[PDB]
Design a protein around this ligand. Structure first.
Ligand SMILES: [Zn+2]
Ligand SMILES: [Zn+2]
Lengths: 138, 138
């Protein structure tokens, strides 16, 4: 056979948002989200590590060419999210609270649409250095 | 998203074989394989369980239609192996010892050529009720 490995690439984007749910009242939203509920919003330099897994090619020695990984990530992460206000600039967040969990899910789905079946293994999102979410499609 | 499950189908086939390595001398072969080395062969009623996994379709409620899995197994297992001599009738075993392990591997590779990418989860082969091999592509 051929050896299997996991290849990861890290990228970062700047975006703003406000944690708010229309299903909760003005007071409930304040209790649940606190400072993150600030009506004018706030922002982050998000860090995303995308991991793909597969066999190491016997000729090129690559699981997937990083050039292609960069292209997929530009398309699924950078273009829709970089320098955007999450809740107002990206349709998906019109009715989905923009938590780190949901940003990870959003990124996972975007990549699935582009990558080869079974290529995607993990999406890790650092909202800040101390708040991290891992989503593996489960 | 959709719930994910494993769908298995059992099939049996009758075949004969002889455990014998070209790469070994007649006596080394005897010490290694014992009675399984009987010059004119011997046989088994092999039982094979093939498991596929994926999402349960929201309308049909099927991970894959058993009708289609049956057809896949007919092409991958029954046509080439049923009522055959492993070592003399199937090209693959010309230079590969027909152990239960190698039969599981052979079946795995056959199914992989036919099945949707990522569909195959496991191949289980019972050479007898007491001798079993599970192969998961590792
Ligand atoms: Zn925030
Ligand atoms: Zn045998």
């Amino acid at each position: 056979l051929r050896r299997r490995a996991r290849l990861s690439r890290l990228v970062s984007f700047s975006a703003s948002h406000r944690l708010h749910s229309p299903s909760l009242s003005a007071e409930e939203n304040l209790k649940v989200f606190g400072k993150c509920n600030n009506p004018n919003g706030h922002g982050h330099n998000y860090k995303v590590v995308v991991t793909i897994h597969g066999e190491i090619d016997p000729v090129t020695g690559m699981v997937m060419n990083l050039t292609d990984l960069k292209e997929y990530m530009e398309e699924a992460i950078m273009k829709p999210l970089d320098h955007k206000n999450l809740d107002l600039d990206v349709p998906y967040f019109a009715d989905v609270v923009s938590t780190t969990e949901n940003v990870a899910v959003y990124i996972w789905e975007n990549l699935q649409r582009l990558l080869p079946v079974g290529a995607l293994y993990k999406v890790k999102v650092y909202e800040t250095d101390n708040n991290i979410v891992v989503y593996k499609g489960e």
